[model samples]
Target: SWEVGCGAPVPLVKCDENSPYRTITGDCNNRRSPALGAANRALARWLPAEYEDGLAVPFGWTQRKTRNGFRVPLAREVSNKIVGYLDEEGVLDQNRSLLFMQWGQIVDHDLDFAPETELGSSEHSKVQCEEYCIQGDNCFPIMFPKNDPKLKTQGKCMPFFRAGFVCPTPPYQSLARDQINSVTSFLDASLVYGSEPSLASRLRNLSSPLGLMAVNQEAWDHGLAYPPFNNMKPSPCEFINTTARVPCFQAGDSRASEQILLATVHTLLLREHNRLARELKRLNPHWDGEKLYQEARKILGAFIQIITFRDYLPIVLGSEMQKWIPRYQGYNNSVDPRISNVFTFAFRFGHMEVPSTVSRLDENYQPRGPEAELPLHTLFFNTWRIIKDGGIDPLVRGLLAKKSKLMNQNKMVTSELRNKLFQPTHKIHGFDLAAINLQRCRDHGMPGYNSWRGFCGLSQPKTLKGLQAVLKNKILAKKLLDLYKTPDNIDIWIGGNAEPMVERGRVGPLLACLLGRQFQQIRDGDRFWWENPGVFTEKQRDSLQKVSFSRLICDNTHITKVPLHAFQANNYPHDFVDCSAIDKLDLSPWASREN
Candidate 1:
């Protein structure tokens, strides 16, 4: 390890060149560029921004009307007309499981979380923004039109806080505001372990020599395993302010207990880490607790990366688009690997895949009873269901058994999500996630779709006819034209998701390309990526390659039979294999490597 110091303004970086571990802050992952993928960095832009004032203001703000003079339609209107659905349950997946959506979210959170804080133009006007729909500093509330359907926003505007900025600007900066990525862009399980040293310390169980993450004693007594209690606030799990604990679990990520299904998966990962720590300590008795902790952390990161590339991404991007992310050769320091601003919005394509309900199934893979199923909205910020309802066993079964929401362009997003996102017992009520998403994209100042298409080397549509050609649906294109008016004014999020998907993919060509390229940069630029030659020994790599989400499920759950790929839906008891048949990672390969 070596220490290097700059002047008073620049923080000193103490990094070890030979150390086979990543810093908690993600600095020094690139030796030459210490903060390249570190936490709190501003997101990079694929195409330059298109701010209305050519500075911080968003496009389509009042003065500009639209980039083309016709005011771009309200995001709420676009959300309702384009993506809104009134039908019960919407369309269900025939092929992929709801676990597919869960995996997408896990990866999304692991790599990037831009915490939103600023609201109201002035510091004191924050309350006015919430109460009277006034705008200020970071506040950009989605002011609804007079005719807004009562099925959605009840008032003139809903509260929105734009993502905050990074500290100290670099003069290499473009003119507009770029949002911060509050976590590492690396595929490290920063969500499970954490992106900062303080939170990471709070997550670990430091009392013993073994490197196990802390679990809630109260939850364990209730026959459920969960992350340690959030002495820090996490979600509105304590919205009512009672001593009801264990339901609000905290891990490396603040959102660990944001939903029941996400909570269960975090529990699964916590168990997997402890299992690795246990196995690792057995073989290398001389290794210290910190060493064991980082090793398990490193291996878990490998599991996440492997799952994303081998199982998850191919399904989302399909083989044709998957080719964009070439097979790993080795670490390439030339790649910036910073998460792009467009990517933060583009990956929202997974919104179409979220199922409306969560099924808590019995061993037979059937709901135990009618009461066993739950509306998805109720689980948001409610983890009591997992602690008291049935524990993680049934939740895990439910995720694997239920089909994902069909990514049907006709019935785009679930109504529950559109209407009842997180209905806390507040005066105004729940938010529309769809409307908020488009508004956020606009607030972040992303260039519209044509720019992105040209950036990705896809054909850029110039007119309604060109858009119709790109969309391949006359009615949909006509509707989009009515809302956005011109092809150039269409929001990148909207246009990217509007097109027909390529074979075996959930997203269209533009979205697939954007997501594909982001993942490629994330992998190739990661020096400790599992596939890189020096990161793992060949034996360790071979053993890690055997690791699968099925093995994770087998190791972490009460389910006895699971399909080889949990992302793929299967008929109960027919294609499912016994737990023993799943191949788990062998830690024998990791023995004595650091000793």
Candidate 2:
């Protein structure tokens, strides 16, 4: 049983009595559990106020300024040299599949903003602020380095008005209050459930049962399907030099069709929904579409939890830090798992892991030659590659077989992601990811590196010499000293990324701490966490525990064999296994006797 309310003494009540699903534990069937949303909508929860006076501050942070009159180097310039440097790729004990990165982004979108809209108008800007800005009430200028040799205008920095969190009280009031508001702010799978009731209802085909969401079976036929958009007309993905228009289906998140990898994952989940619907249909023939849909949606949400916790987190965060994650001792209503500013910006470290090229491998696990490998930049916004090429199987193979770039102190990011990101397609020649990372930190008014280190329970460095000892890289330490003139003024992202990693760890200490805390909160705060007693029967839980990315690929795509742990860099003693050898999710545990 779980009670929903806010305050110092969090309430824990029995699950809602009126819930129509199973009643083994009051919460297992509680559809309205703030933890679970209606079949098609996002979780129905509001952001929790962090500050006592209803003002938000950077999470676990305090602001500091540069020493004397010194100013940091232009963000773009530092980004070019440090963040985007290229060298030989580093392999790790874990594979860190592209799937995990895509999943991370999708999860991030669930808790973050939609496309930015004007402050008071219904109209939206189709063009990004990164592009040329139009002078109007809605447009705000984006800041660039004024004196940089690369800048066309070398005189002054400009301001851009982007959407940000609004403070309810004065002294904190401004157009740029907080960086941006994460719509749901909780890890309750808002990506699967619409964030609003209206959007959720639209996601469902109400004509059928009470819970099933509408899915595109025709697109499924081509192994490319998604939940259709409600009010908006279909926007066909444009192809280069082709009259053929490839129809793109919409989903809860607008970024679903942004890239092939994202679309692939969305399609898999779409199929998973329909697959559950069919299974529930067989088990409870008398149940209406709504019941079946809701039940299936609930199950799908549980699977996502299982995948994230059981499969993904351990690999990314490393096993040592995972010990800090609180065990499921039932749900604690008092815990608020809102998106933290530190986690939001620092996790962008994954951008460094992206490889310059998206390679394809043959059935024998050999390279598919130069023609098959495509520039990662060219793949952005181009769905035609999936259709024109041999569908998503090759891409999936490449993601599994290809190694990810390491996020070590040296060789942080690749040229492809740094200089050529969203290039020719957006018609922007040189977009620097590193620059964007630095600018975004300042835009959000994030606290300095030393401040975050202290917050993370680490010894804070008071001087450049102390900072140098911590970094152990003479070049990077000198660069920081020259750029900001003091260790206190180093940006959190720069410092966090620059720190030497824990032995065999993907991220440095600061990131690991934030990730660990955030994930722990996600598990503890949610009443309907998959491992909670009532969420699933023991048998179903066992089946879910066995589910892996390899199994997912085998079940959904044409690929028949893959490494059991897709995140591992090499397939040795744990070699590639047949699709049949992988475990399958058993739904019999969900069969109803009531029909």
Candidate 3:
């Protein structure tokens, strides 16, 4: 068997005890024999070119075409230095050209050429691959930092590239004897070990370098090899000195129909928002000079929350959940068909089960679950459950209840008051807080109000007509209102309106400079903040698209839109008016038509 280690599994094959080269050759030969046979058309039906290609470069690789009329390269090239070392050892023995041709064939069969890199990079690739395999497709992980075998093994390939190159260089180490003393002098006694332990005593009690080294060695000794090839023989491809191999579909291997569906929906939502923002601006020319600008800020904030949640959820829960939970659906949301593409992709890939809270009729045409028959009202409570169980639960719980309170109160409350008033008393107690604050604001004279109603301007009805139109306009506004009170939502609002407001001279130049300041208290003296040193006025959906969906979901901290007695009216409720007022504004024909 091949040497075992972390990362890719070692090839599996047995060897004769008597042979001198048996240790390496036997396992390698067995590991690749099936692949070779398939390559040569034996068992052609069972072992297609695509399957054979993935086998050759199990860990991801890159491809480079040759000038000679030989075949294409399969795995990516290691450094010339590594290639040179292998050549000096005479690893190829002979048949170097044939080995190159084999790699080429593998590449030609498996990989797809693309100008752009894959999403979420290496770790994402693994998740994507697992997803593809779950759906009964042979999938391969794509590695990044193409030359680094270590990173390739750890599945860092995708993130490293997708998120852009972050600093990887090790920090400089101190060589001086006085270095320890200097560092100790700089340590904060209050923050480090505190008054309980002196730095010198702590250092003395700390484990020694030698002890750490020994511990590391012991751990390595006990670690298992990857790909489980520990004792298998090495293959000719592994032994080959040349770089050329067949091309494989690094980008397309994990591509599935469901993923395309998600991408399309995501893109469409973005386009629709932009269209609405522009249309609203046009229709509201007579609005208060600052009204459109303020409204734009609010709408943009909601957009940011949506984008941030989209990028963040995947990273927090693992990419398996990236596509589920629906894009832009905050906590306690139902499975909207408009964004079902998100969950459909996950269900199609097998990362998540059909949510217990939301389901539909199966092929037999029976209701899939208790709530399946109530699709419109079927909230997937599990999405909120997962959000709570995820590592950010405590923080989310604290922030969701307190954020809007601090904003409304405009003064910081004492810790004792917070504990007594904000602590949840029951499982659903938090829901009451979300609903109470949302409705109280509306009753206190916020006209055209809705929970989470930041983007109502975009959903303005062309001419009030059917129930569906009215519902859409109301829901859209409520969502925006929820967005306005969220800090994370503030980021998007500032970003979205940054450019347009600047052009209109609504926001002063000093606004950009104010981002970094820490204001101790406002006139009301309630909400305190350390302003971020970044301006957000010019953001567009496309500009923010590069942010990862995984990072955004976990960062959301707004109180959920939970109503206590009834769902709030999305628009002005016509039913609430006195009958005489309705009679004064409308004729009998209009009343009859609406009824």
Candidate 4:
């Protein structure tokens, strides 16, 4: 049995290469002979040509085999780890000191729970598996604390380690191991939110022949590479119905149409979650039902964001667009061919089917007013990127493409979704239209060609460490705190309800605080050793008041100033207020309409 090392160099097990168990344990063993291998061959018969030889089948076999052998080694490893941990009792108390030392480092140094930071850098990486399941496309809803063994409304189904004073039960260990394994699987499997065409067989029952044709047409329009019609043109018959007429569709802005479709996708996801929540509540009546449900919701949101951000983006935008978008720009463009084909269909047919009359929107231009409002190109691009990286299934991708294309063709009405209530009247406000133009960019222009990259944190003049440093300093801290304090200042606006606009103005400050809090939490530990103001702690709130308001306002105003060209070129209206008067007026609770 292997004794766990002090979490520094994680203890690794080595097995002989020729052993049968080595087939399970080997770092790079191939699974060509498992029962799953037979299943893979069966699946290949129905799957895309790319998937016939794709990596997923082999990986699935590997995971299944590994899971079968997991128990014995894992139990032994956990016991040894407990003993090894106990050995530290002479140097530190296990309950408070050692636990804090181990877990604190894991939490603070490892898990930067603050938003804006990626999970790979954070300690919460351990729980990423649970997050994946909540957002997965095929996920059956899971409810926690069934009947609340604790019976408190506020009580959560705590982790086994936290709940048990000593060792966790086999059930708990199994769950924990499963969770950890799922995380690893999720890391391996690309998850994406709002993936398409997944419900095709179900929809096939309800839709008319024309509706189905329109669906396929729409799928092609979205660039999904469906067979027998990879380059198929839309039939005029699909658009002759009363449902398919719209000025935007006629004009080929399809942004409006795409928006309706996007709304439908969002609504479907929300509906699924809500439906699952209801079912779980029915099954577990006394389970502090709301508590379990809310956890599901949080888990769902995290899961959705990860999948949507990772998998969806690549599919919708084309795997190549992943090279241009934020977060995904650094990732390699080499996607599995099956997934690649789906995305090819998505970009080709989805919005590309629109009439050539509509010109692409300028990526740099901001909206001048309601009529001149730009489509949410960034959102579509980002969402598609998320899905592609997240590894959504190709069939689902096809279904999504199909629906999206139909919506783009104005064959569907999306008035049912509450979140999209204003969409009918407002048209699509955010990036769906912009996404159409993004494809246009890829086709006619190059991403790096003109050099007008969006204001990504990576593209921003500041580095993560640099931003952390700035937030940590007394002088800069005073300025940020002052900005928060004087909420009515020209820069600070609170409770701005405007969609997209709110995101633009708010992301900067929100990310600033997120990074600030993260820096404060991590700087005291060894992983990151920079000194930061004790800003996140309870006692630090008092010190904020001690700092003088006079010292807060200063020459640091340059920090918030966009380049002169950004202001001059901005299509949106701006009121350039005097910097000196910003302190005199208390702008707290200011709204976007006023600012």
| TM-score for all models, in order of appearance | 0.93, 0.80, 0.17, 0.19
Best by lDDT: 1
- Between candidates 3 and 4, name the one with more favorable TM-score: 4
lDDT of 4 by residue, 268-365 (tens): 23333333344444544444533333323332333332332333323323332323333312211122101111111112222212211111111122
Give the local distance difference test score of model 2.
0.60
Query: What's the lDDT for all of these models?
Result: 0.80, 0.60, 0.20, 0.21
The candidate scoring highest on TM-score is: 1
lDDT of 4: 0.21
**For model 1, what is the C-alpha lDDT against the true structure?**
0.80
Candidate number that wins on lDDT, 1 or 3:
1
Better of 1 and 4 by lDDT: 1
Model 4 worst lDDT run, 10 consecutive residues: 177-186
lDDT of 3: 0.20
Question: Candidate 2: misplaced stretches above 4 Å?
Answer: 1-72, 86-95, 114-161, 167-176, 205-212, 217-244, 247-249, 366-370, 423-429, 570-574
lDDT for each residue of candidate 1 in 1-595, tens digit (9 for 90 to 100): 2323111232657889888899887888997888888887778877777777777777646645568677878877888788887775548878788899999989999888777754333455555666677666566777776667753536677767667765433332244577888889999999999998899988888998788888787656234357776764443776623455444788888777767889889989999998889899989888898999999999999999999999998888885554788777888999987899889888988888887788888888887767888788777777677776777888888888888887776777787687677633333336677888888887888888888888888887777888888899888899988988787788888788888878997888888888988999999899999989888999889999998888898787777888888999877888789989888788888777572
Model 2 per-residue lDDT at 276: 75
